[PDB]
Subunit: 190 residues, 2 copies
């Protein structure tokens, strides 16, 4: 069934508008993280931005055309330090997966748009992990554990792949000479 | 002076919301142009998307924080063939530089935000050239002149830089073997 005139139609566009702004905000926060010396976090912001582009794309492809008026609130700014940006990003994700998407999914099911309702629910899952990632990094910054841990571990240079073993990432990579900012905890997800 | 409570504050966020959606739409149209076999046009859509990201960034940095409600209409879809996408993109740019930005600049000046008004006016200039580019490519497609002209000229392969001299781009690049889709008119802007 068509979406024309349905509340779901406006909800999809509203989600698209929000996801679109989130993509820009995350890319900006990614640039700020770079300036603040947090390369892994910067790349995480950029990856999240690209994933928001994909949520938006799925939503956009459901629309049938024409201009549609929407009424919604969005974050008017701002770009602060990385810790603050991570906190603000997490808060935005929280609202999306706890309030917005469940509401949109609910209304979709009500109006008879099952496929779309399920897509809203699925996107909410992605947003929750996005929040987890942001909250975890904010915590690392607050606890001063971004580049230092209590026990010896392995740190990988994102720039060249050098692996450093120790309680903390080195001031400079011994292989590529790039600063500590490029190091992350060595991760294996395969 | 602060922007809080001013119409300009809402106009900036509205512009940001629109520029944000345009970035996504242009990236999607860029992907469709690739599928349609128009590499130069695809790269132009991607470049325009990146520039929209920059208009949005300038606008975003003027905001002072907090959640703000906005009321505006946006294109609910859609992704069609490249010619149609170029036409729809041009129409959107036209509205922005003829109606929206001049109005926002006008109101900014009225409320006493000179710097911001001038930024709105400046962005409008960029949008007009964006439209010109889109309209020119739509015309090339309509006239069947994307890869063929009446007089012998030079065609450059965007993939490897090979330069072909003739009335039209070759079916396959003789250097890198990529399809005609990668060719553009050789351009010199320096
Ligand atoms: Fe999102
Ligand atoms: Fe998200
Ligand atoms: Fe624009
Ligand atoms: Fe534009
Ligand atoms: Zn290194
Ligand atoms: Zn070639």
């Amino acid at each position: 069934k068509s979406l024309k005139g349905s509340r779901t139609e406006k909800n999809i566009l509203t989600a698209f508008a929000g996801e679109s702004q989130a993509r820009n905000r995350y890319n900006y926060f990614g640039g700020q993280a770079k300036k603040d010396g947090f390369v892994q976090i910067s790349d995480i912001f950029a990856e999240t931005a690209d994933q928001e582009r994909e949520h938006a794309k799925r939503l956009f492809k459901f629309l049938e055309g024409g201009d549609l008026e929407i009424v919604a609130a969005f974050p008017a700014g701002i770009i602060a330090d990385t810790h603050a940006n991570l906190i603000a990003s997490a808060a935005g994700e929280h609202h999306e997966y706890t309030e917005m998407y469940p509401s949109f999914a609910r209304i979709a099911r009500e109006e008879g748009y099952e496929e779309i309702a399920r897509v809203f629910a699925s996107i909410a899952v992605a947003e929750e992990f996005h929040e987890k990632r942001f909250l975890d990094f904010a915590r690392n910054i607050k606890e001063g554990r971004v580049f230092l841990r209590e026990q010896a571990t392995k740190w990988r240079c994102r720039n060249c792949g050098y692996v450093h073993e120790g309680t903390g990432a080195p001031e400079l990579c011994p292989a590529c000479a790039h600063p500590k900012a490029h190091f992350e905890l060595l991760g294996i997800n395969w």
